[PDB]
Amino acid sequence: VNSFSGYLKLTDNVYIKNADIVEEAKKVKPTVVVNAANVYLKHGGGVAGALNKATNNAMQVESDDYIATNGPLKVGGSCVLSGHNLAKHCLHVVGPNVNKGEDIQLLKSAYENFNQHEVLLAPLLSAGIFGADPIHSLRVCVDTVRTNVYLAVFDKNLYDKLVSSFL
């Protein structure tokens, strides 16, 4: 039993809700919130910009030190950093950005990072400003993640469309 509320159960382990991931994380304080990161951890917009703003830019400060030490992530890769005031840990995961021409096949690799964590609050990877089809992202999530994932969907029409079209 955990403290996530109002989620529709899609499968044994995947749950979905129309919610603002920042407000969700602040309420639940999950062990892990997933960020829709880029390889440079430049949290400008989308989910990443929103989460970073909620940390008063502390996420960006921590991220800049991470990059200065380690260099960029790989597309499809991840790193674990602090969750600041939002969660214990933030798993920064780089899904392919279609608007940069990146290979959508790397989306499965991106979701595989979730399997290293028993429970996560997450967005749909490569959705929103990353330019992929959210229906496809949900399908890959369901077919890749085996741990318990609570998906927070910003767009209401999308949430309803994702639910009504879910196979």
Q: Is 127 in the site for ligand A1A9D (CB under 6 A)?
A: yes
Q: Do strands 78-82 and 89-93 pair parallel, antiparallel, or not at all (unpaired)?
A: antiparallel
Binding test (CB under 6 A) with ligand A1A9D, winner from 4, 15, 16, 22 = 22
- Please tell me the distance from the alpha carbon of residue 70 to that of residue 129, in angstroms, as a whole number: 26
Sign of CA dihedral 77, 35, 7, 2: positive
Q: Are 104 and 98 in contact (CB under 8 A)?
A: yes
Main-chain dihedrals φ then ψ at residue 150, nearest 5 degrees: -110, 110
Binding test (CB under 6 A) with ligand A1A9D, winner from 20, 103, 133, 160 = 20
Residues in 134-153 at the binding interface with ligand A1A9D, rule: CB under 6 A: 152
Binding test (CB under 6 A) with ligand A1A9D, winner from 140, 154, 159, 162 = 154
Binding test (CB under 6 A) with ligand A1A9D, winner from 10, 129, 135, 163 = 129
Beta bridge partners of 123: none
Residues of this chain that interact with ligand A1A9D (CB under 6 A) are 20-22, 36, 46-47, 50, 123-124, 127-129, 152, 154-155
